[PDB]
RNA sequence: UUAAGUUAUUAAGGGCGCACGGUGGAUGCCUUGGCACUAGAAGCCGAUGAAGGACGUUACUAACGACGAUAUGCUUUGGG
């Protein structure tokens, strides 16, 4: 998910998306550990999604001040 | 046949010369790194936590670089 859609989302939606993305990342890591993950690029994709979500959240809580 | 006399051949190995190899890294050529300077700029950083480090971050990750739990990177504005 890109920064444009992230900015479309609302703050509560940003937090929920961060939670679900972190849960997905955890599941991906566990599959990788157990040897059940072939599509390894998903880990990096989700990591960058989380980074973008947090970036937009920080932008909002900065511009509020 | 005898006697007297003379002189070879031998190379175990060695010497000189020659040929062919090996080892070794000189020499020639080369440059990625240095050395001395010129002109211009700049001449401080730090409790808003520095210099320098430790430990981590990748699908696989021992090391250097980069980066910092938003980690082998995030947003934005321009270039291409």
What residues does each domain of chain A span? 2-65
Nucleotides of B under 7 A from a protein CB: 58-60, 70-76
Q: What is the resolution of this structure in A?
A: 2.4
A10 contact to strand B (CB, 7 A limit)? no
Please count the CA atoms within 13 angstroms of the CA of A10 that sit on its side-chain side: 1
- The CATH class of the A2-65 domain is mainly alpha
Q: Verify if strand B has an atom below 7 Å from the CB of A28.
A: no
Q: Are A14 and A52 contacting, i.e. CB atoms less than 8 angstroms apart? A: no
Rg (CA), chain A: 14
CB contact at 8 A, A2 and A34: no
CA atoms of A58 and A25, how far apart (whole Å): 21
Point out the nucleotide closest to A42 (alpha carbon to C1′): B59
Output the six-digit token pair for A25.
């990342």
> How many Å apart are CA A22 and CA A19, to the nearest integer?
5
8 A C-beta contact, residue A7 and residue A60? no
């Amino acid at each position: 998910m890109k920064a444009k859609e992230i900015r479309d989302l609302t703050t509560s939606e940003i937090e929920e998306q961060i939670k679900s993305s972190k849960e997905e990342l955890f599941n991906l890591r566990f599959q990788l550990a157990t040897g059940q993950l072939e599509e390894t690029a998903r880990i990096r994709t989700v990591r960058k999604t989380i980074a973008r979500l947090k970036t937009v959240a920080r932008e909002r809580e900065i511009e509020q001040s």
